[PDB]
C-alpha cells in the first residue's frame, strides 16, 4: 500500500548505515 | 542471495496483509449484513403497523 | 495469626506471577523469530537449557 | 531487477483490497434489496388479517 | 543458577537433536508452543 522514502547520506558511512539498518529493523527492510 | 530472503519474507508480509485486511472486510460485510436486514425490516414493519 | 495467610497469599501469586512471567518469554519468542526469520506458516521452534561455565 | 517484483505483487493487493469492495458493497446492494421480500411477505399477512376482518 | 533461552528456525527439528549431540554444554530440551495468531505487521514490531 505504502513504503517510500528516499534521501542523501556520504559515501563513508554507507557500510555502517545498512549494518545498523539490518540490526534494529531485524530483517524485513530493502536497501538499493 | 541474502537480499532475496529479505525480499520474499516481505512478498509475504504484503499479501498477509491483503488476506487479513479483506478478512475484516469481510467480517463486516457479515456484521452489517445481519444488522441492516433486521433494521429495514422494522422499518417495514413499523409502517404497515400503523397502516394497520 | 497473619503469618499463615501471608505464606499461602504468596504461593499462590508468585506461582501465578511465575507462569506469567513464563508466557511473556513465549510470546517474545513468537515475535522477532517471524522477523528474523521467514514467515511461510510458522517459525519452526525449539528451545534450551542452560549451562554454566561452559558458556 | 528487484523493485519491478516488489511493487507490482503490492499492486496485484491492491486488486485484492479492492475484492473486498466488491464483495461486501455486493452484499449491500444485495441485502438491501433482499429487503424487499419482507415487503411482499407481510401484505401477505396483512391480507390474511384483513379478510377476517372485513 | 541461569538459564538460556535460544530458538533456531531455518529435518531442521532434528538438527536441535544434533545440539543435543553436544552433550557437554547443555541437555537442550524442547519447550513446544502453541501457534498464535499473525495477521498484522506494523504493530506486531510495536508490540515488541
Known sequence: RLGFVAGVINRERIPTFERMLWRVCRGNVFLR | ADVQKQIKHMMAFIEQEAN???????????????????RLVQTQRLKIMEYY | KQFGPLVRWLKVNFSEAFIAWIHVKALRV?????????????????????????? | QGIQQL????????????????????RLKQAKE?????????????????QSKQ | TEFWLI???????????????????????????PDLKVGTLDVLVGLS
Open chain 4, 7 to 26: 511493487l507490482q505483487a503490492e499492486k496485484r493487493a491492491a486488486e485484492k483490497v479492492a475484492d473486498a469492495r466488491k464483495r461486501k458493497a455486493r
Open chain 2, 20 to 38: 487479513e485486511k479483506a478478512e475484516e472486510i469481510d467480517a463486516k460485510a457479515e456484521e452489517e449484513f445481519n444488522i441492516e436486514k433486521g
Open chain 5, 7 to 33: 530458538s533456531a528456525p531455518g529435518t531442521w527439528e532434528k538438527l536441535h537433536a544434533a545440539t543435543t549431540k553436544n552433550n557437554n554444554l547443555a541437555v537442550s530440551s524442547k519447550f513446544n508452543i
Open chain 3, 30 to 55: 513468537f515475535v522477532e523469530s517471524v522477523l528474523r526469520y521467514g514467515l511461510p506458516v510458522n517459525f519452526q521452534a525449539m528451545l534450551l537449557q542452560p549451562n554454566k561455565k561452559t558458556m
Open chain 4, 34 to 50: 433482499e429487503a424487499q421480500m419482507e415487503v411482499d411477505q407481510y401484505r401477505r399477512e396483512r391480507e390474511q388479517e384483513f
